[PDB]
Design an enzyme around this catalytic site. Structure first.
Site, PDB file in Angstrom:
ATOM      1  N   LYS A  37      -3.260  -4.200  -5.767  1.00  0.00           N
ATOM      2  CA  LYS A  37      -3.229  -5.756  -4.918  1.00  0.00           C
ATOM      3  C   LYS A  37      -2.095  -6.585  -5.856  1.00  0.00           C
ATOM      4  O   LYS A  37      -2.530  -6.768  -7.116  1.00  0.00           O
ATOM      5  CB  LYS A  37      -4.791  -6.492  -5.400  1.00  0.00           C
ATOM      6  CG  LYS A  37      -5.281  -7.697  -4.806  1.00  0.00           C
ATOM      7  CD  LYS A  37      -6.550  -8.050  -4.890  1.00  0.00           C
ATOM      8  CE  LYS A  37      -6.834  -9.281  -3.921  1.00  0.00           C
ATOM      9  NZ  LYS A  37      -8.130  -9.703  -3.876  1.00  0.00           N
ATOM     10  N   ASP A 131     -18.691 -14.172  -0.894  1.00  0.00           N
ATOM     11  CA  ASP A 131     -17.445 -14.009   0.345  1.00  0.00           C
ATOM     12  C   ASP A 131     -17.558 -12.745   1.092  1.00  0.00           C
ATOM     13  O   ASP A 131     -16.623 -12.024   1.450  1.00  0.00           O
ATOM     14  CB  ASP A 131     -16.062 -14.159  -0.497  1.00  0.00           C
ATOM     15  CG  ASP A 131     -15.033 -14.195   0.561  1.00  0.00           C
ATOM     16  OD1 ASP A 131     -15.390 -14.710   1.742  1.00  0.00           O
ATOM     17  OD2 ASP A 131     -13.821 -14.039   0.258  1.00  0.00           O
TER      18      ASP A 131
HETATM   19  N1  LIG Z   1      -8.660  -0.990  -2.456  1.00  0.00           N
HETATM   20  C1  LIG Z   1      -8.596  -0.860  -1.122  1.00  0.00           C
HETATM   21  N2  LIG Z   1      -8.079   0.170  -0.247  1.00  0.00           N
HETATM   22  C2  LIG Z   1      -8.064  -0.216   1.048  1.00  0.00           C
HETATM   23  N3  LIG Z   1      -7.611  -1.398   1.535  1.00  0.00           N
HETATM   24  C3  LIG Z   1      -7.655  -2.389   0.830  1.00  0.00           C
HETATM   25  C4  LIG Z   1      -8.272  -2.316  -0.539  1.00  0.00           C
HETATM   26  N4  LIG Z   1      -8.018  -3.526  -1.019  1.00  0.00           N
HETATM   27  C5  LIG Z   1      -7.631  -4.184  -0.118  1.00  0.00           C
HETATM   28  N5  LIG Z   1      -7.680  -3.678   1.069  1.00  0.00           N
HETATM   29  C6  LIG Z   1      -7.034  -4.348   2.364  1.00  0.00           C
HETATM   30  O1  LIG Z   1      -6.375  -5.761   1.945  1.00  0.00           O
HETATM   31  C7  LIG Z   1      -7.111  -6.792   2.368  1.00  0.00           C
HETATM   32  C8  LIG Z   1      -7.266  -7.806   1.520  1.00  0.00           C
HETATM   33  O2  LIG Z   1      -7.649  -7.543   0.352  1.00  0.00           O
HETATM   34  P1  LIG Z   1      -8.470  -8.581  -0.576  1.00  0.00           P
HETATM   35  O3  LIG Z   1      -8.929  -8.198  -1.921  1.00  0.00           O
HETATM   36  O4  LIG Z   1      -9.650  -9.278   0.729  1.00  0.00           O
HETATM   37  O5  LIG Z   1      -7.153  -9.450  -0.772  1.00  0.00           O
HETATM   38  P2  LIG Z   1      -7.596 -11.177  -0.801  1.00  0.00           P
HETATM   39  O6  LIG Z   1      -6.251 -11.861  -1.329  1.00  0.00           O
HETATM   40  O7  LIG Z   1      -8.599 -11.490  -1.803  1.00  0.00           O
HETATM   41  N6  LIG Z   1      -7.834 -12.015   0.807  1.00  0.00           N
HETATM   42  P3  LIG Z   1      -9.581 -12.133   1.275  1.00  0.00           P
HETATM   43  O8  LIG Z   1     -10.441 -11.000   1.509  1.00  0.00           O
HETATM   44  O9  LIG Z   1      -9.581 -12.865   2.648  1.00  0.00           O
HETATM   45  O10 LIG Z   1     -10.230 -13.084   0.425  1.00  0.00           O
HETATM   46  C9  LIG Z   1      -8.419  -6.354   3.055  1.00  0.00           C
HETATM   47  O11 LIG Z   1      -8.570  -7.049   4.207  1.00  0.00           O
HETATM   48  C10 LIG Z   1      -8.345  -4.574   3.281  1.00  0.00           C
HETATM   49  O12 LIG Z   1      -7.943  -4.406   4.622  1.00  0.00           O
END
Ligand SMILES: Nc1ncnc2c1ncn2[C@@H]1O[C@H](COP(=O)(O)OP(=O)(O)NP(=O)(O)O)[C@@H](O)[C@H]1O
Length: 262
Positions: A37, A131
């Site tokens: 991430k 969330d």
């Molecule tokens: N470990 C993982 N494996 C596969 N896909 C992932 C993974 N982590 C995140 N994703 C994808 O990336 C997107 C966003 O990751 P996320 O952790 O939700 O980031 P964010 O910045 O916190 N945005 P949000 O979820 O709206 O708060 C998710 O919608 C997934 O589809």
């Protein structure tokens, strides 16, 4: 161990975060496959969420449950921050919901069960995810649900940072009021409804409009939702947080028991 970008071979993008993307990646030494991430420090500061990002790393790195996505570690550099996450092979429940339109009762009740178990574990530590929504639910290799993204988690009680879509937020949160672990119970009820209907119970074209609906708890069931599903969803979507059931009561609800696989 102190990690660094040179330790990883980055692959295809897995998703678009709010401060950067998530990438499939492999650790060069072990050949371990995982997710990275990537958040840009610039934006993280411009939003002053370093406390959230710290609460995310701190809370998630200490959780150990098969229905909760694992956070192995993290590192950063002059420009960004890198969270090292367990990779979920089968993507989001969100995408699966787009593909299938809506889930049958067996799939729905199974996902609810994995969630309730996962939230129970989180609530034993007095941790509120806050969330819970389709795009934060990831699927393991065996298709098992895994709550992810603790970027909003905080220990109960708590107050409240700005917002986006209200769809899954409880009245107490959209009203800035104080809240506790009951927030996640409301969200679970929102999910159960969305799983069976294909869209959240308070959806709307306007933010203002959605706020009214959540605030007033204005939702109706399509004819095809069984009474057993309506009973559970209705116990879960109570305006008064105190009325909302315990996760144990959910895990034991008849409709859940008669339909769930896990
Ligand atoms: N470990 C993982 N494996 C596969 N896909 C992932 C993974 N982590 C995140 N994703 C994808 O990336 C997107 C966003 O990751 P996320 O952790 O939700 O980031 P964010 O910045 O916190 N945005 P949000 O979820 O709206 O708060 C998710 O919608 C997934 O589809």
């Amino acid at each position: 161990r102190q990690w660094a970008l040179e330790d990883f071979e980055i692959g295809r993008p897995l998703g678009k975060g709010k401060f950067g993307n998530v990438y499939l990646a492999r650790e060069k030494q072990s050949k371990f496959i995982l997710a990275l991430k990537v958040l840009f420090k610039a934006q993280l500061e411009k939003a002053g969420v370093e406390h959230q990002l710290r609460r995310e790393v701190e809370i998630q790195s200490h959780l150990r449950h098969p229905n909760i996505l694992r956070l192995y570690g993290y590192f950063h550099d002059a420009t960004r921050v890198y969270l090292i996450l367990e990779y979920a092979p089968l993507g989001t429940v969100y995408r699966e919901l787009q593909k299938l339109s809506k889930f049958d009762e067996q799939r729905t009740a199974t996902y609810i069960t994995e969630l309730a178990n996962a939230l129970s574990y989180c609530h034993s530590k007095r941790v509120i995810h806050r969330d819970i929504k389709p795009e934060n639910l990831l699927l393991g290799s065996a298709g098992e649900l895994k709550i992810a993204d603790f970027g909003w988690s905080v220990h109960a009680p708590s107050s409240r940072t700005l917002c986006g879509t209200l769809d899954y937020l409880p009245p107490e949160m959209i009203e800035g009021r104080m809240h506790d672990e009951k927030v996640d119970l409301w969200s679970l009820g929102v999910l159960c409804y969305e799983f069976l209907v294909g869209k959240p119970p308070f959806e709307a074209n306007t933010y203002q409009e959605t706020y009214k609906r959540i605030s007033r708890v204005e939702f109706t069931f399509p004819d095809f939702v069984t009474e057993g599903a309506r009973d559970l969803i209705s116990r879960l979507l109570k305006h008064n947080p105190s009325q909302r059931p315990m996760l144990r009561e959910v895990l034991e609800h008849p409709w859940i028991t008669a339909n769930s696989s896990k």
